[PDB]
Design a protein around this nucleic acid. Sequence first.
RNA 1: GGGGGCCACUAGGGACAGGAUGUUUUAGAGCUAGAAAUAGCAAGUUAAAAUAAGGCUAGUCCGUUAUCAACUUGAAAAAGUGC
DNA 2: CAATACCTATCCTCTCCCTACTGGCCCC
DNA 3: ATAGGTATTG
Length: 1334
Amino acid sequence: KKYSIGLAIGTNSVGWAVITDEYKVPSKKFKVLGNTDRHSIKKNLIGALLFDSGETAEATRLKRTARRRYTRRKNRICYLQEIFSNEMAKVDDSFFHRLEESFLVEEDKKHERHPIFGNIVDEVAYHEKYPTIYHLRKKLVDSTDKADLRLIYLALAHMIKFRGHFLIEGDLNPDNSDVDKLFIQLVQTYNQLFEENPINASGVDAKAILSARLSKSRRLENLIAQLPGEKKNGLFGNLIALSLGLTPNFKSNFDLAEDAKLQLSKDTYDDDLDNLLAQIGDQYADLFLAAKNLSDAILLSDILRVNTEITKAPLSASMIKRYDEHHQDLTLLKALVRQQLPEKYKEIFFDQSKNGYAGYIDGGASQEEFYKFIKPILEKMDGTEELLVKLNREDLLRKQRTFDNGSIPHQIHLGELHAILRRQEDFYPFLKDNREKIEKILTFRIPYYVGPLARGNSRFAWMTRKSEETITPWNFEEVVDKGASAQSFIERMTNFDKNLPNEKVLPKHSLLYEYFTVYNELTKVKYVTEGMRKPAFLSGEQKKAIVDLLFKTNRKVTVKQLKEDYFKKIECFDSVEISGVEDRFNASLGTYHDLLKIIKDKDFLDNEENEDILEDIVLTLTLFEDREMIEERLKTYAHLFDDKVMKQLKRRRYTGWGRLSRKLINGIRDKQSGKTILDFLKSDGFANRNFMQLIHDDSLTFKEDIQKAQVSGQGDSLHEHIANLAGSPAIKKGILQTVKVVDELVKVMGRHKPENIVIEMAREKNSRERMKRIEEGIKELGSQILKEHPVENTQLQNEKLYLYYLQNGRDMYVDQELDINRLSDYDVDAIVPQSFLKDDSIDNKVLTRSDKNRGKSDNVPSEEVVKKMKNYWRQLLNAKLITQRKFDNLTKAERGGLSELDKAGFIKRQLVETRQITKHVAQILDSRMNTKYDENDKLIREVKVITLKSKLVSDFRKDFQFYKVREINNYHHAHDAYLNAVVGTALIKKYPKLESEFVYGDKATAKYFFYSNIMNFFKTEITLAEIRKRPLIETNGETGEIVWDKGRDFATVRKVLSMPQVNIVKKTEVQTGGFSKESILPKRNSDKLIARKKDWDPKKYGGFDSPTVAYSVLVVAKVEKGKSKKLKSVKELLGITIMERSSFEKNPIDFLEAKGYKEVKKDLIIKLPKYSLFELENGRKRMLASAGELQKGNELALPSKYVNFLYLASHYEKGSPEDNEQKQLFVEQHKHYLDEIIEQISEFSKRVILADANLDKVLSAYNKHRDKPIREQAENIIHLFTLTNLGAPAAFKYFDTTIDRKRYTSTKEVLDATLIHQSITGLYETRIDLSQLG
RNA sequence: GGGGGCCACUAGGGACAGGAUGUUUUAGAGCUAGAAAUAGCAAGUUAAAAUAAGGCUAGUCCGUUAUCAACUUGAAAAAGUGC
DNA sequence: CAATACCTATCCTCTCCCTACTGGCCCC
DNA sequence: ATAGGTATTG
Ligand SMILES: [K+]
Ligand SMILES: [K+]
Ligand SMILES: [K+]
Ligand SMILES: [K+]
Ligand SMILES: [K+]
Ligand SMILES: [K+]
Ligand SMILES: [K+]
Ligand SMILES: [K+]
Ligand SMILES: [K+]
Ligand SMILES: [K+]
Ligand SMILES: [Mg+2]
Ligand SMILES: [Mg+2]
């Protein structure tokens, strides 16, 4: 008994099928367990396992980190209160107690209800004097009087609890504050550099213009308008643009060749400036640095909108400005509405449901919603011009706690905190002794390279302690070994050398590693001249000369430089031909040139004695990113360089890691030669062996030492091995389920292993990324397309509009503008044709007015289009609006277009699966099936694991009319698995030589033709560019075995696809995750509310509702009834929530009795996860959606004729026009299939769905559109299956009629139905008659 | 075919440090005419505290990912059970 | 019970490691 | 975006 398995792996399904020699699917009697009268059941060996998607770890991580941050903010406040304890006790012995119980109702409060002062008079007086906390903050910063200790605490706690960001290193307010002064200093530096072309900046109000609440480019235009004879793209204009945060190109300002694009935000600017300073000199450095200072000024002016010379609290003063303008504008608006629109006053200032001022302050209206609601009211009235100005500036009736306060640096809060401490430490000595402690509470961050400050109970922690004691912000540098912790931070994530598994890999920018790469590439170079008989390798002397003369003098080395600067200058060759490198060398000595610029000592870099030192330096500059730790590590080399060089060296940093270790590159030595790997690369006689040849040569000891150094370690489990794969967690869930399915199927066939296993793997918020890409590309481009055409992110889900914006609103084949409103008239063309590369992504698509303008449609765009559009394409490439691959494909005609080789490769790619994750699945299955070794100690491959791409079975379905319609049911997953088994086995039988291509384990016209016509052996007649005909029976050429009988096997496939009994199994899963919805609802007199804290009664304090049920339990017990508490027997479903799960499982009986149940039949407790299957009458099935709701549990097995009719009639997906005509004729001849399909659906619904209202609405809708075209009627009959689909009910639409979901809001009936426990395949069942309980 | 190093791209996964809102209860004395219902007017911008209930290992740690039909024997892990 | 309509926490900065899609140079 | 919870209305 022989058989094969077909598998279809998806992100929510695993289809599976078993086939015999005749491509038939067996059927077996399977024993049935339980307490029903049924002892067995017939099952076909085909089905599909369905499951909810596997989830990433991201949301869990975000919740975890927010948890940690809440804890640490609480600890900051706790430190501060601990500092204030004794003196506050002297002042007010319950202040902190009133603060801790502020949330409690007065009934539950243990102290007076007024928190600050404890009496109503003083509290009202405080609120009258300081209506906001910022009033008190400003007062305490500015005033000189002794203050109440409680108000000091409140100010400092407000600064510490909400302390602002840390995006700016160092100190702040370094007199970079004033915009006028930095603008005048920029003018002075510019006039110093250009005495002939000076700028008259007199009468220019730089403060108002540059600090104006306007866009960057608008403020730039405003400032340039004040400068006659100066344009926005000149030098001064570009400096102002750089200071405003734009991306000015200083190429044209200085007549440069290398595109000097500078933005102060990018991390590359530090290099992008030095690069630039490499051309025009260092005399312009002062100018750009002054511009950066001005940028700092404007950024601060965005936040501090008040004069910094009237107060040391400009932030608090700016919040007070917000408050005062709010008060004035509110008084004015109230009076205006009273006078002009008196009937709208109540809706505006009293209705919290409306988005007026009432909903803005008391309701749920945002600032944006309130502005939208009130803009027409202001425009409609008179005297609202200034209010409209403030509204369009987004500065009208502003609150102080707002979404845009994330701009505030922590240094500003720190300045105000330090000012208050300076004021009040003259009266409170403990503030003087603890001033720096409080400042440290504010300023201290746990460094990212340290992680959780755990003590051996955090699987996320890696920190090591210098001493075993509690870590505080004041003793961190002493208790925490920041060095060891920062080293572990990187070393716990970096790879070891695979060749030497005990050695750490080198830094990517290690001098040794780059020497290795350069010599490795250089060794395989070959050259010819005239008198030479044969291409020769470069000798060791030649390679050293090339390294010293070219690689150590140019950051990049081109083939032109190799021909002229070496072969001409040294060898006296006027003509030379080179092989092994094209255009320029890929490897380069970048770090050599970095360090040569920094230390300016070439002899130091060339001396082999300093190697170690340099290797350490780079190592440091790669391990660490904190400049203090880098300084502490480089201190051991302080004697070798000047303080200038040491400063530059500590400023330089690297990221990235190589893939080989130092001990492999330049460590282990061949036994006889005594030479390392790099020694062979530098010189190897006339063999010139590279890395692979060196470590694979049996006449050397490298290979044997690699073998010896190898270790294997502990083997992973199946689950561990799958978890460690590189892929999406969803597809890994699919992979694990696939392995389990295979195990069960092997057990079904009596532990006999299959002949073949054919596997196919399906292909695998976002508009936010689209808007980000378009914004960055248009700004980098310098275009105003978002100015003239504003777009929202959702709109970018239209392909043509997204392409339009990615192309700057221009045709890509013609240098012309494109119209937005005409996008329907344009074309979206494939760069490389889809007949070769089935790529439908933006990476291979292009928006053009007419695809005819691409050239010839059989290839890549023509040379003429490339000549026309290459510069504009490069512009789109540099703005990252197109990728470099899209550009390269567009420009392929410059390189000869598509050769025959490329077309052969594309067609082969369409059929041979090369994705790595599918290879890993194949390896897992192959290693589980084939375990024995032959006489030569080589693996015996009893089971051949074939992998296929989806297009094979897709084209099979479309060519032999085995069509699929996904919306009818879930049977198509199983059918895909079956067709995979059939096609794969038949293909490898017909052409065994293809095993290397399709089975796991170890001329261009010819291969193009062959792989194009690989599947023709199924057809009877083939029309290929005339008509040929194949025999009825197809056999193998060598064996003579039969592979395909076209008269009988197609009927077999049809009968298999027609079978109504298909094992669809929805994986039952316990629900995990959040306890409930996250909304903190207000107080309500409902027992659905859940306390947010143990003592916070939700009837007083509000709380959560809508908990998630982890799983239900069947309870058979008794409950007290009525005032007499008489015991009444019950049987019901109890939903154990996620929050209750641990309590219930620790002791189920106590939990159930606390819920009210008595005399619980402990052995009748049945655990029922989500999707538990129940069968009722007439084959009607239900799945558990919760403890109080049910999902549909049956599959509508629509006959095959109706499925294919729906496919063809709906124009689901063509072929010859004669075959199109035959299909159309079949549609029109079987039009009565519409009524027959409605009849099938109606019978199914009346038997199983039981939604009378919805079914009647659907029948009326179908009888309403009987005159509609067959196309639309079929397309909407497709929608109708939402009523019958397995799973949760969902709303659908038949034409314009909407059918809302009929839900099953009660689970009482399943308590007397039959529970069905299914194995993973559903072939093994345990059926429990629940009616026999109770 | 499978595999490695390098260059260029493209898409994904995992971890650390931090900020700003939102919400919830309370505090921010509402006033006047009416028995009340109510009417008229005044006012509004701020703060405290919580932000998964909680846990023991008590850390400035952990608490939403992965994994789960049923039954037997098992403390569990784990095996085993049906053409 | 049954049906119906409404509800559903959001945004942002920053350090770093890893694999893998395709194209290319050289090899095992 | 789903699809399960919830109060409201019978
Ligand atoms: K009280
Ligand atoms: K101008
Ligand atoms: K609001
Ligand atoms: K607020
Ligand atoms: K190259
Ligand atoms: K670094
Ligand atoms: K020195
Ligand atoms: K889970
Ligand atoms: K879930
Ligand atoms: K199951
Ligand atoms: Mg907590
Ligand atoms: Mg708040």
